[PDB]
Amino acid sequence: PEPGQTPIRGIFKSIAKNMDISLEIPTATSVRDMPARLMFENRAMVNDQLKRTRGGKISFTHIIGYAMVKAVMAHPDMNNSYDVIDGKPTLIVPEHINLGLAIDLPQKDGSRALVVAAIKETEKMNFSEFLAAYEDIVARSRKGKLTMDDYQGVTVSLTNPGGIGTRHSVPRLTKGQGTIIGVGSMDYPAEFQGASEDRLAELGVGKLVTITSTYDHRVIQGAVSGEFLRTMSRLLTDDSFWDEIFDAM
Amino acid sequence: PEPGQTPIRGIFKSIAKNMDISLEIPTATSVRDMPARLMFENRAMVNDQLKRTRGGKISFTHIIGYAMVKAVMAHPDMNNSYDVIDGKPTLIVPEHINLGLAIDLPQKDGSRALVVAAIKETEKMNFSEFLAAYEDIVARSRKGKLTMDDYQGVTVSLTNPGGIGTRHSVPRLTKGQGTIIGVGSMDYPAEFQGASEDRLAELGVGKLVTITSTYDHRVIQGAVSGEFLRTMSRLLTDDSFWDEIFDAMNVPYTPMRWAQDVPNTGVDKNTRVMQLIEAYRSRGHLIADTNPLSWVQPGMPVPDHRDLDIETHNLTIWDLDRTFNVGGFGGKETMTLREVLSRLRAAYTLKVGSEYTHILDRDERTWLQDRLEAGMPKPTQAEQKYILQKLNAAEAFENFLQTKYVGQKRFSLEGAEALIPLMD
Numbered sequence: 001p002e003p004g005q006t007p008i009r010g011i012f013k014s015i016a017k018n019m020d021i022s023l024e025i026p027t028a029t030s031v032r033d034m035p036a037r038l039m040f041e042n043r044a045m046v047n048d049q050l051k052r053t054r055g056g057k058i059s060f061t062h063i064i065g066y067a068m069v070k071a072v073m074a075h076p077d078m079n080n081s082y083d084v085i086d087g088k089p090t091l092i093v094p095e096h097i098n099l100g101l102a103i104d105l106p107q108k109d110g111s112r113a114l115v116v117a118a119i120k121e122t123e124k125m126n127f128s129e130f131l132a133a134y135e136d137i138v139a140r141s142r143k144g145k146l147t148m149d150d151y152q153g154v155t156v157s158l159t160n161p162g163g164i165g166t167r168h169s170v171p172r173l174t175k176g177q178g179t180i181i182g183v184g185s186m187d188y189p190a191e192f193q194g195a196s197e198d199r200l201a202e203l204g205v206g207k208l209v210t211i212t213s214t215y216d217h218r219v220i221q222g223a224v225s226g227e228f229l230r231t232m233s234r235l236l237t238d239d240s241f242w243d244e245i246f247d248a249m
Numbered sequence: 250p251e252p253g254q255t256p257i258r259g260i261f262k263s264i265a266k267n268m269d270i271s272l273e274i275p276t277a278t279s280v281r282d283m284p285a286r287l288m289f290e291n292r293a294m295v296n297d298q299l300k301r302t303r304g305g306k307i308s309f310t311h312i313i314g315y316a317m318v319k320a321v322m323a324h325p326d327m328n329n330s331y332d333v334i335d336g337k338p339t340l341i342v343p344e345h346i347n348l349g350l351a352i353d354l355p356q357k358d359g360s361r362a363l364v365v366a367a368i369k370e371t372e373k374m375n376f377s378e379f380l381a382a383y384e385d386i387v388a389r390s391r392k393g394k395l396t397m398d399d400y401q402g403v404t405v406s407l408t409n410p411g412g413i414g415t416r417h418s419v420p421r422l423t424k425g426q427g428t429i430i431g432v433g434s435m436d437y438p439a440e441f442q443g444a445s446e447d448r449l450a451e452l453g454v455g456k457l458v459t460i461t462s463t464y465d466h467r468v469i470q471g472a473v474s475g476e477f478l479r480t481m482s483r484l485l486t487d488d489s490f491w492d493e494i495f496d497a498m499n500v501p502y503t504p505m506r507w508a509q510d511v512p513n514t515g516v517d518k519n520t521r522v523m524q525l526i527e528a529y530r531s532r533g534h535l536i537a538d539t540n541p542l543s544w545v546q547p548g549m550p551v552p553d554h555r556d557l558d559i560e561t562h563n564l565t566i567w568d569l570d571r572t573f574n575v576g577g578f579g580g581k582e583t584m585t586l587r588e589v590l591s592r593l594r595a596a597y598t599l600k601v602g603s604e605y606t607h608i609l610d611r612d613e614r615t616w617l618q619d620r621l622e623a624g625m626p627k628p629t630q631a632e633q634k635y636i637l638q639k640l641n642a643a644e645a646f647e648n649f650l651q652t653k654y655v656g657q658k659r660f661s662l663e664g665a666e667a668l669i670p671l672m673d
């Protein structure tokens with residue numbers, strides 16, 4: 001690359017500014033690893049049904065995203081944020097659960113940028129509605145028909161560095177939000193990446209997913225964040241949770 | 250310890266100040282666990298070559314350090330830093346990749362301090378150059394002859410808390426840098442630390458290393474950091490990466506190849522092992538270190554010697570520690586594949602290459618086989634000195650004629666002086 005000093009401008013300047021503002025948020029992180037076997041099996045069944053129907057195709061982020069929404073409803077404290085109004089610390093309780101998706105956008109110029117588009121009012125959706133709303137945001141982001149309203153009102157964020165193969169991450173929390181959830185790689189642990197399928201199948205080793213919760217510690221306690229991740233882990237292996245998805249699809 | 254309040258001064262004061270400055274950097278961390286089996290195997294081979302050469306000894310930090318440099322070249326964004334020039338946010342793109350090593354220095358006073366010494370211009374080095382530059386910095390740091398220039402110009406840092414046994418860490422990023430890479434413990438997971446080697450070998454559990462990337466989020470995106478770690482993971486198990494290192498360190502054997510364990514189905518592995526033994530006894534000479542020159546004649550057809558690779562016999566690295574019946578090979582009924590390979594290589598691929606399996610008489614073949622596999626007996630010092638005298642006489646005679654009769658044909662033996670001790 002060509003050395004030298006180039007001023008930061010455009011979307012990148014706004015990103016840099018927001019990261020500087022985020023320094024004023026005291027954050028803590030909870031990390032939990034969850035079995036992913038049942039997620040692999042049941043997603044395959046759903047995709048098989050969609051194939052015969054000639055519909056679409058769900059991803060792991062759809063399932064985890066929906067499970068996350070359910071877990072926030074079970075633990076509403078995770079949706080709260082902090083602010084200083086009139087010079088007093090205030091606990092903001094949002095009216096809806098607006099799920100922010102971290103969407104990586106490799107631009108045609110060459111550089112890549114990350115944006116957080118909101119899926120609004122997720123607390124009043126089923127899986128079918130959630131999937132439609134999810135795909136709408138993603139579809140528009142690629143073609144680049146996102147309005148300013150799409151970027152506003154985010155109450156909780158979801159990021160998926162696990163696609164690249166990152167085991168887990170400790171992301172930054174943006175101002176005006178309570179927590180951000182990171183989804184790690186859904187793969188065998190590194191110590192099993194050389195083992196044969198026969199030996200793994202014999203022993204009964206399953207794939208895992210690591211989920212992180214980075215939250216504002218001024219308004220969210222560590223126990224609440226822990227219980228939130230526990231709920232998510234339970235949902236992903238719950239009969240009722242998967243029955244709901246199967247009925248919807 | 251003695252209670253009280255003591256002002257911080259010296260190097261410790263500068264460290265404390267720098268850590269306070271680092272609070273203004275919004276950092277995020279990516280964590281990735283990588284298989285370390287191939288790193289253990291191939292490092293052993295390199296160190297074995299250095300032992301015979303009587304050279305040095307490479308470490309895991311050398312390999313990971315070099316792989317990290319390669320990964321930064323593949324992802325240059327990781328080398329960029331942030332600064333405010335004239336009151337405007339600026340993206341600084343450095344001209345070189347200066348790798349900072351976190352060196353722990355237990356001082357003679359009693360206290361220990363950490364310093365970050367720079368290896369400069371790593372983007373224009375091979376492994377040999379990198380290793381030399383690495384060792385130079387480390388050597389000088391211990392004796393304490395580091396100049397001020399060594400501490401300046403760091404663009405990216407590498408820290409290794411894994412030596413102590415820390416699984417992974419979330420370190421702090423210093424101002425003027427884009428990212429810092431942390432290397433965790435290269436060991437079995439805690440859940441396997443009580444398991445027997447037999448059960449681990451049977452299942453095919455490998456050691457892992459956890460690498461972290463802590464980066465300035467203002468200039469480096471999470472996707473870039475993720476892809477950086479992915480590249481590092483690929484390099485550490487890449488054939489090309491290890492071929493480059495082997496060539497630099499002059500290792501004659503083919504590196505062990507990353508491959509999945511194979512089931513003991515069809516042809517038994519005991520069969521395969523004894524086929525490997527016959528392969529080496531028959532064709533081991535094809536890869537023997539018999540040529541004094543590193544020379545291959547262009548236009549001479551290179552024979553195929555795939556029969557000497559364990560892959561050809563449907564064996565893998567995961568079979569190395571498994572025991573097989575070798576039917577009296579090496580005067581033992583049972584042996585590990587590792588030991589079988591060691592004995593075969595020692596007998597057939599070192600300085601003596603033998604062709605005897607073509608001999609039809611079994612007593613002849615056995616006589617030769619027993620002596621070749623027993624190996625050369627260690628000569629006495631008197632015998633060694635006698636060999637030197639003969640070598641000296643051979644060379645000195647040739648050199649004397651060259652001096653006294655420069656323009657006279659003699660057909661010198663120079664380059665083949667070992668003929669004289671051979672005939673003797």
Ligand SMILES: CC(C)(COP(=O)(O)OP(=O)(O)OC[C@H]1O[C@@H](n2cnc3c(N)ncnc32)[C@H](O)[C@@H]1OP(=O)(O)O)[C@@H](O)C(=O)NCCC(=O)NCCSC(=O)CCC(=O)O
Nearest residue numbers: 059061103104160161162163169171184185186278279471
């Ligand atoms: C909009 C989304 C979220 C949509 O993604 P989706 O998962 O729905 O689809 P996709 O990525 O196209 O999926 C492609 C394939 O990857 C698989 N896949 C997806 N997530 C996975 C995971 N965690 N583990 C394993 N496999 C995964 C899918 O099943 C699919 O497999 P099949 O082909 O079999 O279907 C996309 O843009 C995305 O993935 N963005 C990544 C977010 C990102 O870049 N974040 C920056 C990190 S910022 C951060 O965390 C800071 C800290 C740090 O990490 O450093």
Ligand SMILES: CC(C)(COP(=O)(O)OP(=O)(O)OC[C@H]1O[C@@H](n2cnc3c(N)ncnc32)[C@H](O)[C@@H]1OP(=O)(O)O)[C@@H](O)C(=O)NCCC(=O)NCCSC(=O)CCC(=O)O
Nearest residue numbers: 308310351352353408409410411412418419420433434435
């Ligand atoms: C200059 C270096 C880096 C050179 O180290 P090298 O690895 O080249 O050699 P060495 O340490 O002498 O190696 C001794 C033995 O340990 C092994 N070894 C080295 N690193 C290893 C690892 N990650 N896992 C397992 N084994 C390891 C070597 O193979 C070798 O085994 P053999 O004998 O079989 O060859 C040295 O000073 C060092 O190791 N420093 C430690 C770095 C440090 O203190 N960082 C501060 C953490 S600050 C930080 O991270 C903040 C966050 C936090 O951790 O809390």
